[PDB]
Amino acid sequence: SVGLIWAQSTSGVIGRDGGIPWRLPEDLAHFKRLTMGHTVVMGRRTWDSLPAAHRPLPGRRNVVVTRQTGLVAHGAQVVGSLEQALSPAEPDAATWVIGGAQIYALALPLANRCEVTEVDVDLPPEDEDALAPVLDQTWAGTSGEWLVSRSGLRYRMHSYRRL
């Protein structure tokens, strides 16, 4: 099973300036809970965005997708395409595609689940922003309640599965 997991503003932004333009501790915890013990597949720019104590993401098999065959990525497995990332020599019952926008677009046709955090934060998109994928009629989902973070933002989790 191949799942995507992301957090987006209601406006659809996932990334800006090499990071994530809000602070949502409940989402970091959600991400860690869902992914721990599993494979996490990411694009090279997302690998480069990980803060020091999270590069590699502890307790998970980190797979980095790049066209730079010689790339050094200590703590991760480097592969040359998304298809390679999803064709491991050692299978995993759960593989999560963890971003970014480029890789989500390639992975969406191959996935059967999306776990989405929606963040009610006013962020008019800017020209270099990374944006969330859009789920069409081949997906259906369920939504948790709107919650308020201890740090102030309204957020909610959605779970989608391929019809």
Ligand X SMILES: NC(=O)c1ccc[n+]([C@@H]2O[C@H](COP(=O)([O-])OP(=O)(O)OC[C@H]3O[C@@H](n4cnc5c(N)ncnc54)[C@H](OP(=O)(O)O)[C@@H]3O)[C@@H](O)[C@H]2O)c1
Ligand Y SMILES: Nc1nc(N)c(OCCCOc2ccccc2CCC(=O)O)c(CCCCO)n1
Annotated binding site: 7, 14, 19, 44-46, 66-68, 100-103
- Report the distance separating Cα 91 and Cα 88, nearest Å: 6
Question: Among 29, 25, 21, which residue's Cα sits nearest to residue 124?
Answer: 21
Chain centre distance of CA 55: 15
CB 118, min distance to ligand Y, A: 10
Q: Binding of ligand X at residue 3 (CB under 6 A)?
A: no
> Which CB atom, from 82 or from 94, has the smaller least distance to ligand X?
82
Q: Binding of ligand Y at residue 24 (CB under 6 A)?
A: yes
Out of 39, 40, 86, 100, name the contact with ligand X by CB under 6 A. Answer: 100
Give residue 12's identity as a one-letter amino acid code: G
Binding-site residues for NADP(+) sit at 7, 14, 19, 44-46, 66-68, 100-103
What's the distance, Cα to Cα, between the start and end of the chain in Å? 14
> Which CB atom, from 4 or from 79, has the smaller least distance to ligand Y?
4
- Report the distance separating Cα 68 and Cα 66, nearest Å: 5
CB 42, min distance to ligand Y, A: 7
